[PDB]
Amino acid sequence: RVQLLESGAELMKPGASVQISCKATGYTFSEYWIEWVKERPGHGLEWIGEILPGSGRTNYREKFKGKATFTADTSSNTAYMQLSSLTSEDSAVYYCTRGYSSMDYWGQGTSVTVSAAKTTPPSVYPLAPGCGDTTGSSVTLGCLVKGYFPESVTVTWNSGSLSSSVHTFPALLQSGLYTMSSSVTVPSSTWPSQTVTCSVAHPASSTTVDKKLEPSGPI
């Protein structure tokens, strides 16, 4: 079975170089191109280039020349892509793929995150109605999970409230820091009469923050 095994997630300072590996098994490595492809939310699939192991024939997408370097070791069956001068634009999932006439097998992708940031546990902010409103029959609550790094975090509501009433909003990277939120909807017959709590695990900082949801003002 053709497998392409890429190296693990990278957290890179801007300006650094990263070298992604791609371990090709299941076939004759110097018979096929390895393609490198970039996928970055809202940027579909962008080819970076290809290398033919053993021959060192490469093609590079023009604007990746000077930025991406491909290398291939026919002895280890590993292809590598170096990207130098990392900036926030290079934050993406990178793929190697086997190429010949199509890109018939892909790596699992390598995620590269570019960021200055120190490991930051999120600030966790309750989102509850206030402002002198009356609740309808159902109330939407949430937690805004802001300014953490790196990915990811887990929001859990009273342990088992993904019953399912929960929306977890994918985190968005903004200036090297992450913000996500999570909503939950409960009958107001249950809230604030009873306890609703968001529990925010940030494994990468060995951090967990429980926040009880309470009215932010008169209701």
Binding site: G44, G130, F169
Partner: protein, 219 residues
């Protein structure tokens, strides 16, 4: 270079429905060798792309028979005679004829359900947050359909574009619905200079926005 224009960007279907995706490359894809390197991939969420159809019409090994491709010149079609659950995801055409190899923008094949308007919830900055000099205004727009939604923030009736971070969930497994949060982030001082905070959702289900609003001085 070779622009691959795929329409539609979104294909809602009921399972069992036929599905047709168009790919219009910006030039012919006939190579000097006489082959046409027009291919189709699917990437599912959480997964890497996979080859489905290579050289216009050939189905890559293991690819379901309900998948076929046709076309020539600048018009190519992927067809799924009957859409099955496993077929849901983002389909990409791709031309491997000219360097650099390019991909269409994607077509998201998803479940069609009855149009549903968003339950809009707006929250002012938490006191926890304001205490730190930040002020995030959050609008959850939950359980709406189709995916397309536009959210406008107004601060004292004037539209605010900057500071706004929008995050969609992916299609709900249970109700085929989408949700999105829109977070308006200000300094406490910007925030504290104004009263009226409005989240406006424009969507198909409405000929005029769902408007959700608070006044800082009532909150």
């Amino acid at each position: 270079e070779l622009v691959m224009t795929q329409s539609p960007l979104s294909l809602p279907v009921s399972l069992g429905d036929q599905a047709s995706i168009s790919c219009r490359p910006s030039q012919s894809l006939v190579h000097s060798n006489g082959n046409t390197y027009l291919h189709w991939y699917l990437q599912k969420p959480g997964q890497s792309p996979k080859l489905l159809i290579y050289r216009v019409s050939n189905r890559f090994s293991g690819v379901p028979d309900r998948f076929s491709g046709s076309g020539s010149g600048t018009a190519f079609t992927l067809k799924i005679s009957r859409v099955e659950a496993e077929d849901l995801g983002v389909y990409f055409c791709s031309q491997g004829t000219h360097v650099p190899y390019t991909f269409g923008g994607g077509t998201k094949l998803e479940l069609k359900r009855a149009d549903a308007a968003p339950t809009v919830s707006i929250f002012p900055p938490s006191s926890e947050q304001l205490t730190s000099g930040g002020a995030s205004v959050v609008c959850f727009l939950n359980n709406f359909y189709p995916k397309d939604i536009n959210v406008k923030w107004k601060i004292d009736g004037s539209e605010r574009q900057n500071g706004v971070l929008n995050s969609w969930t992916d299609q709900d497994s249970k109700d085929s619905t989408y949700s999105m949060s829109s977070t308006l982030t200000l300094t406490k001082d910007e925030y504290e200079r104004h009263n009226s905070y409005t989240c406006e959702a424009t969507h198909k289900t409405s000929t005029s926005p769902i408007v959700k609003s608070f006044n800082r001085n009532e909150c």
